[PDB]
Design a protein around this ligand. Structure first.
Ligand SMILES: Nc1nc2c(c(=O)[nH]1)N[C@H]1C(S)=C(S)[C@@H](COP(=O)(O)OP(=O)(O)OC[C@H]3O[C@@H](n4cnc5c(=O)[nH]c(N)nc54)[C@H](O)[C@@H]3O)O[C@H]1N2
Ligand SMILES: Nc1nc2c(c(=O)[nH]1)N[C@H]1C(S)=C(S)[C@@H](COP(=O)(O)OP(=O)(O)OC[C@H]3O[C@@H](n4cnc5c(=O)[nH]c(N)nc54)[C@H](O)[C@@H]3O)O[C@H]1N2
Ligand code: HEC
Ligand code: HEC
Ligand code: SF4
Ligand SMILES: [Mo]
Lengths: 789, 126
């Protein structure tokens, strides 16, 4: 009966959905024909959003390990009031916050948090507990891309937008699998390809999947060798004399990257000791157009081919596309480049091809970084929910930023911490060791998501000197492995906002009430605040300086600033409820949004007025004077480019984008004689990450009940294995029993195996290696050596 | 159906993986709860190819015109392009069907889903 606007709770594509509501129940989920992203189309997971909040498990009561008898890690799980739950959870905090202090409390958020949930978190962790130990799951996802963004453009997120799909002249997919992971975007790309036969698609991959089914230039390379191919193309652009001089001369700089960087592990592990130069990593050092060209020279077509395993004719096909100065290339990449021990380099290398040719910031010509989660952009990245970051591209290191944040958050000078927090991987390690003793996990299932769980994540969560809280909406292994599990109001049970891969920030009202006693993560954060006092947590010096910050309580100081209280319980659309506004007397979202909004607005990042986002189906940001920005850094398209200019990557002072000269390097772990198979890890159309939501929607579960190992039909015959055989995927770190599936969607090359990670019964992340891209610190889940019996 | 792929028994312990469930080939259409709920595929997919050069599905799922009458096999909504205009045949967006239409196996849901139907807010049953 009642249809409400809302963005898909999954994908970074950001499709608009129209939620059907009846009697406090979501009874239908259709495609929003008024949304620019999808325009009435969703994918399987989208249409079934209706069944996501309704598994019979939905956590309804906080659960502590021992109701009475006190609380014992190694206990039971018992119902317990919110107050009780917080009472215990606050005590544990205060203690840790006195024996080892801030560098011992830690949060792990997600690109699935609402814009204001990641903001309330950033605030609470930093302005409150004075700890920059806040990192997101996006660290496993967009770090690499974000990191390269700053380095090459000095500003985060893409300069293009989905509008490119319709304008492009040919698409290059660097290891992406849009067909299954960004369906509606793949639909948009397919419509362009099939509708205009002059268009050409090239998909590169480690194995053959549903995406290289639309390809005109189908390339299957060696895990990690994409680095070489990328340089060949650069060389080819240069050798054939098709560089866009006027562009390179006017809008570019060059540089060389540190070369013996070392697979982000623990110092102690060999690879790092051998890594002369792991102490810098991300060292730039300017250069010369001439030096770059010469570095790229080493990667001859003949050589690239040798390293990848691709017939040279195909690499000539690719190279050329990226070069006829009329083909509007449109490069797209997801976790293939991001979960790469040299991901930041990869990102860098794609931009180079575009910078060299001048194919950027124009409709159709664009290097688009696809983002994974719904708001890894809108929240994690933009609000800055990473260990080293603050809103609008600001760093915790820089004092001017720190100050700026302090001025807006109405805080005493020098309050915000200068130390860089523990990143995702580190966070697990510091947990294993005993450095972080209070841990709050939110909107993620890191016990399944994180790398090497058996080595450093599981023991770290069960370390008795540690207390672990997990806010979630369903059981989950992470929760099973925690000490306090707090119930959350999910998706449409709470008013929220997200930000998709093309800078589109969209909202949604609360359409239904959460089950039992569950409450939004926003609420959880804000309420847990009401427990600490400016005495208790802040340094005395700072207090001395400012009396009004004595007693108070982190809340009056963080959410009752008279800034976030600004707006009344009215101002909230007559229709539509808001549990976080019925409790509390203000309207949190509006307050947080508009406060957080002040960080951008002016300096790029312009968000529109809060209320506007509720009347429209998103606006891609710098929204200046109520007008969205499709292409950034182009005069006429971007308003931050001054009249007499053309292009100006204004993130950089000189307004020139960097071209990095970087060398191919090998993956942390390659197959041996003992472990002959490549272990590629990924996803499947029907399931979202942990399957905590999709494995509960019946049609999705039935469609693909459990995880499976994709293998080559002959690599099986040989070992005397058939389809359906119960195999052991083994590593120096762990084993799983999945069943073999040859003849499935993913057609593996000999020596390569693929297993999706949505199944908690089959924790592949026990098998996976802890290695990261030493610059971005994004772990690499796409390759390691594994044996099968 | 094994250790709640949802909760994982005493985690990381060592779990046996049940055998692949078998696809449901019995050609019976299933029945949905709301318009726009993608029908499930009641038959096999296996050898069916969806590529730049062919779409096995469109071979059986099409609408006949040129004056003749045959039973409809795709809804005309599969003819509208971005912008909603109705093209004279299935539009390329929609070409890769496997993106929205999923086949199904004999698998017992690890947990019941209390999603309710629009008419008679009774837990849905198809
Ligand atoms: N092997 C391997 N591991 C990987 C990757 C890979 O490619 N291979 N991919 C990595 C990447 S890119 C990513 S993005 C991460 C994703 O890893 P996670 O962030 O762990 O993924 P999800 O399972 O979606 O976890 C979302 C959690 O949200 C809960 N939830 C749903 N709604 C709410 C809510 O409103 N509030 C709260 N508090 N909880 C809620 C769900 O039950 C679930 O536990 O995985 C990473 N891990
Ligand atoms: N159904 C569904 N879709 C999703 C999600 C989900 O949970 N379910 N997750 C969303 C999120 S959070 C994310 S981050 C995206 C991830 O989207 P993708 O990155 O498309 O997802 P994966 O399936 O993990 O695909 C792994 C990819 O790794 C490539 N690959 C392996 N090794 C290499 C390498 O060395 N170099 C390169 N260049 N490529 C390599 C393979 O060819 C393959 O396409 O998916 C989004 N889409
Ligand atoms: C999402 C973008 C889709 C793609 C791609 C395809 N289909 Fe579809 N289909 C979709 C929806 C939302 C619905 C409506 C379900 C409801 O309950 O209202 C359908 C329905 C069908 C049907 C049933 C038609 C009927 O009149 O009952 C058929 C036979 C069908 N779809 C076929 C089909 C084929 C062959 C496709 C590939 C070319 C295809 N669909 C793609 C959504 C989407
Ligand atoms: C010929 C055999 C084919 C091919 C190649 C495909 N389908 Fe199917 N399909 C076929 C029949 C005879 C029926 C039952 C038709 C009827 O009752 O009129 C179907 C049905 C479906 C459905 C469900 C439709 C409904 O409930 O109304 C779907 C979703 C479906 N088929 C999908 C589908 C896809 C995606 C295909 C390509 C991989 C495909 N079919 C091929 C017969 C045939
Ligand atoms: S493509 Fe992504 S956003 Fe669109 S419906 Fe599918 S899952 Fe949701
Ligand atoms: Mo992601």
């Amino acid at each position: 009966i009642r249809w409400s606007k809302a963005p898909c709770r999954f994908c970074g594509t950001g499709c608009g959905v129209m939620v059907g509501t009846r009697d406090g129940q979501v009874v239908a989920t259709h495609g929003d024909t008024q949304a620019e992203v999808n325009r009435g189309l969703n994918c399987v997971k989208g249409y079934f959003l209706s069944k996501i909040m309704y598994g019979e498990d939905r956590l309804t009561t906080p659960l502590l390990r021992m109701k009475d008898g006190v609380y014992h890690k190694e206990g039971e799980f018992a119902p317990v009031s919110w107050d009780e739950a917080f009472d215990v959870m606050a005590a544990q905090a205060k203690l840790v916050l006195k024996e080892k202090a801030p560098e011992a409390v830690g949060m792990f958020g997600s690109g699935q948090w609402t814009i204001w949930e990641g903001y309330a978190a950033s605030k609470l962790m930093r302005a409150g507990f004075r700890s920059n130990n806040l990192d997101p799951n996006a660290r496993h996802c967009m770090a690499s891309a974000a990191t390269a963004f700053m380095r090459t453009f000095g500003m985060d997120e893409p300069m293009g937008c989905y509008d490119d799909f319709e304008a492009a002249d040919a698409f290059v997919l660097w290891g992406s699998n849009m067909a299954e992971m960004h369906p509606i975007l793949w639909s948009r790309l397919t419509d362009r390809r099939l509708s205009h036969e002059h268009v050409r698609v090239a998909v590169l991959s480690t194995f053959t999947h549903r995406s290289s089914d639309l390809s005109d230039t189908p390339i299957i390379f060696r895990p990690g060798t994409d680095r070489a191919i990328l340089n060949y193309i650069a060389h080819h652009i240069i050798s054939t004399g098709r560089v866009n001089r006027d562009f390179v001369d006017r809008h570019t700089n060059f540089a060389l990257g540190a070369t013996d960087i070392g697979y982000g592990l623990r110092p102690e592990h060999q690879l790092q000791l051998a890594a002369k130069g792991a102490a810098d990593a991300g060292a730039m050092t300017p250069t010369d157009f001439e030096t770059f060209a010469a570095l790229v020279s080493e990667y001859t077509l003949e050589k690239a081919a040798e390293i990848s395993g691709v017939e040279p004719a195909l690499l000539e096909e690719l190279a050329e596309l990226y070069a006829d100065p009329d083909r509007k290339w449109m490069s797209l990449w997801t976790m293939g480049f991001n979960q790469h021990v040299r991901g930041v380099w990869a990102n860098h290398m794609v931009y180079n091809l575009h910078l060299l040719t001048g194919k950027i910031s124009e409709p159709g010509n664009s290097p688009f970084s696809l983002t994974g989660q719904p708001f890894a952009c809108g929240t994690a990245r933009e609000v800055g929910t990473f260990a080293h970051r603050l809103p609008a591209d600001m760093v915790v290191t820089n004092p001017e930023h720190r100050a700026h944040a302090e001025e807006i958050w109405k805080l005493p000078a020098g309050l915000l911490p200068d130390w860089v927090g523990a990143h995702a991987v580190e966070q697990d390690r510091k947990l294993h060791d005993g450095e972080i003793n209070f841990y709050w996990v939110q909107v993620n299932n890191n016990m399944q998501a994180a790398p090497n769980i058996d080595q450093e994540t599981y023991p770290g969560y069960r370390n008795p000197e540690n207390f672990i809280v997990v806010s979630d909406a369903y059981p989950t292994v992470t929760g099973r492995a925690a000490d306090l599990v707090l119930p959350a109001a999910m998706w449409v049970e709470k008013e929220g906002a997200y930000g998709n891969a093309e800078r589109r920030t969209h909202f949604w009202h609360q359409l239904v009430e959460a089950p039992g006693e569950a409450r939004s993560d926003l609420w959880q954060l804000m309420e847990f605040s009401k427990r600490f006092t400016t005495d208790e947590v802040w340094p005395e010096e700072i207090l001395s300086a400012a009396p009004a910050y004595r007693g108070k309580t982190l809340f009056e100081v963080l959410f009752a600033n008279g800034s976030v209280d600004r707006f009344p319980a009215s101002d909230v659309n007559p229709d539509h409820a808001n549990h976080e506004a019925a409790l509390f007397g203000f309207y949190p979202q509006k307050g947080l949004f508009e406060e957080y909004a002040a960080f951008g607005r002016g300096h790029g990042h312009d968000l529109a007025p809060f209320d506007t986002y509720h009347e429209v189906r998103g606006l891609h940001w710098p929204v200046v004077e109520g007008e969205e920005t499709r292409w950034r850094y182009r005069e006429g398209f971007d308003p931050y480019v001054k009249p007499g200019e053309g292009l100006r990557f204004y993130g950089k002072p000189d307004g020139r984008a960097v071209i990095l000269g970087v060398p191919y390097e090998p993956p942390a772990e390659s197959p041996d004689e003992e472990f002959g198979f490549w272990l590629v890890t990924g996803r499947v159309l029907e399931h979202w990450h942990s399957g905590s939501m999709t494995l509960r929607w019946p049609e999705l579960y039935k469609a693909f009940p459990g995880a499976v190992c994709f293998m080559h039909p002959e690599d099986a015959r040989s070992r005397g294995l058939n389809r359906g055989s119960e195999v052991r995927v083994i590593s120096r770190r762990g084993e799983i029993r999945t069943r073999l599936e040859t003849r499935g969607r993913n057609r593996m090359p000999r020596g390569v195996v693929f297993v999706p990670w949505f199944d908690a019964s089959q924790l592949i992340n026990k098998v996976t290696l802890d290695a990261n891209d030493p610059i971005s610190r994004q772990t690499d889940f796409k390759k390691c050596a594994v044996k099968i019996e | 159906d094994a250790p709640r792929l949802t909760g994982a028994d005493r985690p990381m312990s060592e779990v046996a993986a049940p055998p692949l469930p078998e696809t449901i080939t019995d050609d019976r259409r299933v029945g949905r709860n709301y318009p726009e709920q993608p029908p499930v595929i009641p038959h096999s997919i296996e050898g069916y190819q969806l590529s730049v050069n062919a779409n096995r599905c469109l071979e059986c799922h099409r609408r006949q015109y040129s004056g003749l009458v045959a039973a409809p096999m795709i809804s005309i909504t599969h003819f509208q392009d971005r912008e909603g205009q109705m093209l004279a045949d299935v539009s390329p967006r929609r070409y890769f069907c496997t993106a929205c239409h999923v086949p199904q196996t004999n698998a017992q849901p690890l947990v019941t889903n209390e999603f309710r139907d629009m008419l008679t807010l009774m837990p849905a049953s198809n």
